[PDB]
Amino acid sequence: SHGLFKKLGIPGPTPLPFLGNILSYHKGFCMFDMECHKKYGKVWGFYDGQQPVLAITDPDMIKTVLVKECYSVFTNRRPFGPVGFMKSAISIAEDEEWKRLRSLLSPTFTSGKLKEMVPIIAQYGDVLVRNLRREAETGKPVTLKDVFGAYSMDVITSTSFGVNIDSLNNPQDPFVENTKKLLRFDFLDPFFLSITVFPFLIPILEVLNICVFPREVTNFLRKSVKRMKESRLEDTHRVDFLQLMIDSQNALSDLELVAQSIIFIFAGYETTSSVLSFIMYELATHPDVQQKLQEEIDAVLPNKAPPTYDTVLQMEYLDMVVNETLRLFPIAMRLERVCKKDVEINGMFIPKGVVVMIPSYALHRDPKYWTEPEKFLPERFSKKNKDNIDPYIYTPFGSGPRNCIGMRFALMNMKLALIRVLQNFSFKPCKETQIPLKLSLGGLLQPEKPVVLKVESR
Numbered sequence: 001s002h003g004l005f006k007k008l009g010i011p012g013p014t015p016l017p018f019l020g021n022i023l024s025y026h027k028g029f030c031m032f033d034m035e036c037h038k039k040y041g042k043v044w045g046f047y048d049g050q051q052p053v054l055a056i057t058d059p060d061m062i063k064t065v066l067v068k069e070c071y072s073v074f075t076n077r078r079p080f081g082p083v084g085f086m087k088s089a090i091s092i093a094e095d096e097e098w099k100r101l102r103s104l105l106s107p108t109f110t111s112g113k114l115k116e117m118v119p120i121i122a123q124y125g126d127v128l129v130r131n132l133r134r135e136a137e138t139g140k141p142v143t144l145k146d147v148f149g150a151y152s153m154d155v156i157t158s159t160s161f162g163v164n165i166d167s168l169n170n171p172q173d174p175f176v177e178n179t180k181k182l183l184r185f186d187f188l189d190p191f192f193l194s195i196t197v198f199p200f201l202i203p204i205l206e207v208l209n210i211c212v213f214p215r216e217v218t219n220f221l222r223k224s225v226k227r228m229k230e231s232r233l234e235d236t237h238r239v240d241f242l243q244l245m246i247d248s249q250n251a252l253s254d255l256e257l258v259a260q261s262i263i264f265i266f267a268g269y270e271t272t273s274s275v276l277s278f279i280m281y282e283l284a285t286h287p288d289v290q291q292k293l294q295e296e297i298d299a300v301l302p303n304k305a306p307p308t309y310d311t312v313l314q315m316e317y318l319d320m321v322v323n324e325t326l327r328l329f330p331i332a333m334r335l336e337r338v339c340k341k342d343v344e345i346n347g348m349f350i351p352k353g354v355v356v357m358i359p360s361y362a363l364h365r366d367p368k369y370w371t372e373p374e375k376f377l378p379e380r381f382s383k384k385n386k387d388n389i390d391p392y393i394y395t396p397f398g399s400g401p402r403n404c405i406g407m408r409f410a411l412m413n414m415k416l417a418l419i420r421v422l423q424n425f426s427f428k429p430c431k432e433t434q435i436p437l438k439l440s441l442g443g444l445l446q447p448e449k450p451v452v453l454k455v456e457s458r
């Protein structure tokens with residue numbers, strides 16, 4: 001097992017028995033990835049316990065796996081942990097099961113569908129400024145994660161389900177409470193450290209019904225969504241996510257409906273608020289850019305005009321800012337696909353069962369692609385420069401048919417928030433503000449201490 005890469009002629013850190021190369025994650029595993037790049041070059045291998053994982057950095061080879069050969073060989077991600085009824089969630093499903101889920105759910109974010117969500121979010125656009133406005137008065141610092149979290153939440157519930165829960169009215173909300181308690185993925189947390197390293201214990205916990213959210217958060221939402229379904233089940237309106245799954249129960253199912261709902265609620269809450277917090281951090285430690293964006297917004301939307309679908313896409317510099325923030329903090333860290341048969345991609349033999357890994361975080365910081373890769377430089381994404389940029393190196397949303405199904409909704413939502421927040425306020429560091437920011441070594445791409453900034457009226 002541990003002789004695969006030495007035999008296949010592929011370089012790597014020498015694994016230990018049982019552990020594999022586990023102990024190298026103490027640094028945080030984005031750093032591990034970095035080092036390996038710099039040390040081993042353009043392809044390397046390592047072992048998550050007894051699981052061989054082959055990292056790849058070549059743009060062609062990446063394209064092959066993410067795009068050309070997705071259907072035939074590289075179809076699924078690495079088996080998650082114990083997931084019980086969540087095994088049917090789109091992000092976790094495999095093969096035939098996945099293909100249908102993907103085609104059935106993709107019509108949720110289209111040219112028209114997103115368009116229909118603007119006026120709805122717009123209400124929470126309003127409700128956010130009004131939240132901040134009262135802290136803007138007081139003067140003592142603000143945790144963005146929380147204010148953004150509450151926004152994110154409102155926007156996901158109301159769009160997917162057409163259910164206003166007005167979480168911005170509520171630093172006392174059941175939903176954000178249970179939903180945030182959802183993940184325990186810390187690399188250096190006792191739990192998952194034991195699974196990829198005892199992967200044969202997964203089949204066990206499944207029997208026990210012990211989950212990565214043991215019965216609590218899911219029981220909540222189980223009957224929670226059971227609640228939303230029935231109201232709609234009679235009262236006629238809008239054809240939405242909730243609805244599109246009632247359209248296909250005319251070959252979908254009940255626990256199956258609940259599962260995608262959860263995936264969405266998590267994604268829409270956590271991804272969105274986390275990134276939005278990194279963007280505000282940057283705008284504060286880079287005042288020039290904050291002002292320059294505040295100019296773009298004012299010019300396109302004069303007299304603090306309400307943002308819209310088409311005005312949003314008009315904003316070049318906004319987009320540059322978003323893309324640049326994502327270059328630095330590509331929240332997935334790594335893209336992964338399991339090799340489901342013996343294969344040869346661009347000259348290299350890859351054996352069945354191997355996990356092929358793309359280290360987004362590291363490629364986003366590769367000194368051999370990006371001048372001053374540590375520095376936050378939005379201009380590197382201008383129309384002049386936006387085309388020297390390999391879409392198989394810069395991949396914050398993955399690529400190919402298994403890429404981020406939420407991408408377009410993510411961008412609009414985020415931007416829709418930024419616009420409204422920057423046309424009413426400015427943002428500046430204080431002496432809680434960690435300069436420069438530090439990522440936690442724990443498995444998530446998080447700031448180790450929360451992001452806290454000062455908010456002034458305009």
Ligand code: HEM
Binds near residue numbers: 275403406
């Ligand atoms: C800025 C926020 C976000 C980032 C950076 C992001 C990034 C990603 C990335 C990189 C992948 C995997 C791509 C690949 O492996 O090739 C992904 C998968 C996915 N994302 Fe997004 N995402 C974001 C927001 C969202 C939102 C708001 C939703 C809600 C709809 C969403 C739903 C999904 C689903 C369901 C998958 C698995 C796709 C599949 O297996 O078919 N994500 N996310």
Ligand SMILES: CC(C)(C)OC(=O)N[C@H](CSCCC(=O)NCc1cccnc1)Cc1c[nH]c2ccccc12
Binds near residue numbers: 263406445
């Ligand atoms: C645990 C559960 C079922 C609630 O969600 C997951 O599937 N877990 C993964 C890890 S969650 C943190 C990753 C992150 O910061 N956001 C990335 C993301 C999440 C959701 C949608 N779009 C982007 C979440 C996950 C689902 N599919 C993935 C593919 C690659 C990497 C992570 C994920």
